[model samples]
Target: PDAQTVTSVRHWTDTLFSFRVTRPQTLRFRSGEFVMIGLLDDNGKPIMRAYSIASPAWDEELEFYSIKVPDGPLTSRLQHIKVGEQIILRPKPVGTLVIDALLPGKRLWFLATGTGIAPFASLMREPEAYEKFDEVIMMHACRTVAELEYGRQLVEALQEDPLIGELVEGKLKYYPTTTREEFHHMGRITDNLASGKVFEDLGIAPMNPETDRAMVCGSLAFNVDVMKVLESYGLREGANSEPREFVVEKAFVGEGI
Candidate 1:
C-alpha cells in the first residue's frame, strides 16, 4: 500500500492541523527534507502531495503540518484522517532546507510564514542546528496568532523535550508575529529582518554574511520578498553542495493560499 499509520493528529485551527505517522524502517532522510505522502481518490487512484517532514531526523515517527481547504485535492480529506488510520508515503525525502545546505556560521535563522514552518519544526528539534551554530533563531508569522499556535507549541515543547532539549537550552530564540491580530511581535519576517527589529528584540547582532545563515520557506510571493530581505542583508541563496549564506524551499503550491 506504500502506507504508514497515522499515530496522532491535532487540529490547531479550522484551516490548520499537524499529524504524526509511522516511519518506514527503510526511510533515511535529513531533518529538513520532505517526502510525498497521499491518500486514494474516489476511483482508488493515489493522490500524492509533497510535505515537509516536521519531526527531527532519527525519530521513530514522522510528522507533518498541513492546512485544510474545503475543496483541496488532498487536504479536504486529509484533515479527516484519524489516528491509527493509514496514508500513502513515498518514503523518498528531498528538499533544499537542510542545515547542510548553508555554510557554517555563528547564527542560523529559520524564517517562515504560515505552514511553511514545517521544515523548521524538524530542524529546530535536530541537534545539528544547535551543535553547528552559536545561535539558532526561529521566526514565524501569519495573519493571526491562531495560525502561529503549532509553531508556538513546538518551540515551547523543545524547551523540555528530553532527547535534544539540553542542546537547545540557551541556543534557541523564538519570535512569533502576526499581521492581522495583535501580538507582541507584529511585523512580517521581511519587515523584521529589513528593519532590524528582530535583532533588537532578540538582542542579537545584525545579520552579516560572514556570520549568519538562513533557511526560507513560504508561498511563492512570500519567498520572493523574503529572499530580497535576506539578499539585502548581504546573504546569497545556497544549496546542498554549494553551501552559501542561505537556502529556500517552497512549502506548498496553489491550494495553500
Candidate 2:
C-alpha cells in the first residue's frame, strides 16, 4: 500500500503528540491545508481522518500534531505509531485555511485552541506569511501549561531557525495562554481579545478591518464565539473566491474543550 514513513515522534503530553514523516516527492500542498491519513483496518481497509499538516510547505518532510483519543477509531491506534513506521496519506490536500482565502492586510492573526494549533504551526513558518503582512500574531489557548509546550517550543525555535529566524524575529508575536493551569499568561483567547488585554500586552491596536486579517481554527464553539468578536471589530468572514478580513475552519469534528 502507498504510505509515508515516520521519521520522528515527540510526545508533548499524554494526550498530545507530533510526528514527522517523509514527504512524497510528488506531494504538493499549501500551508494550513490538511490531508486524510490513517492506517489499515483489520480487514486491510484504510480508516483515514483529516489531519492538518503542521510543517511549512517548504519543508522536505511533512509533520502533524494530533490528539490522542482513548477510544477514537483512528487516534487510539495512531498514537502508538513509532519511528520507521508507515501511515497512509492521501496526497490531495485541501482546506479553506490557506493564505489565498484572505485579503491582504497589515497584520495576520493566527487564532487557535488545543490541537487546533496545527494549521497555524504551518503558517507561522511559511515565508509568505511574513512577506504578505507587516506583523503575524499567533494567539493560542490550551487548558494546561503542559498542553501549551509544543507551540511554545516551536515559536521559540523560530528565533533560532537559520532560514526564517531573521524573518520571524520582531515580526512574529506569540501570545499563548492557559485556561486551567497556573502560568505567566492566563485567560481564554476570547476573553483576552474581547477585553483588549492581548492588545495591551502586545502593545498593538485592537483588530481593525483595514489592518487586520485573521485565520481561525478551533472547536465549533470557539470558532462561533471568535467570529462574533471579530465581527464586533467590523471584520467579516471571507473565502478564496471573495477575500475579506478573516477565514475559519473547525479543527476537529467533535466537541472539544
Please name the candidate that would achieve the greatest TM-score relative to the true structure: 2
Candidate 2 wrong stretches, greater than 4 Å? none
* Model 1 Cα lDDT, one tens digit per residue, 1-257: 88899999999999999999999998999999999999999999999889999999978999999989899889999999999999999988999998878889899999999989999999988888888898999999899989999998888888777865676768999999999998888988999889999889999889899999999999888899999998997899879789999999898775356
Tens-place lDDT digits, model 2, residues 104-193: 889999999999999999999899998888899999999899988999999988877787676665899999999988898889888899
Highest lDDT scorer: 2
Provide TM-scores for the models: 0.96, 0.97
* Ten contiguous residues with the weakest lDDT in model 1: 160-169
Could you tell me which 10 consecutive residues in candidate 2 have the lowest summed lDDT? 160-169
lDDT of 2 at 49: 94
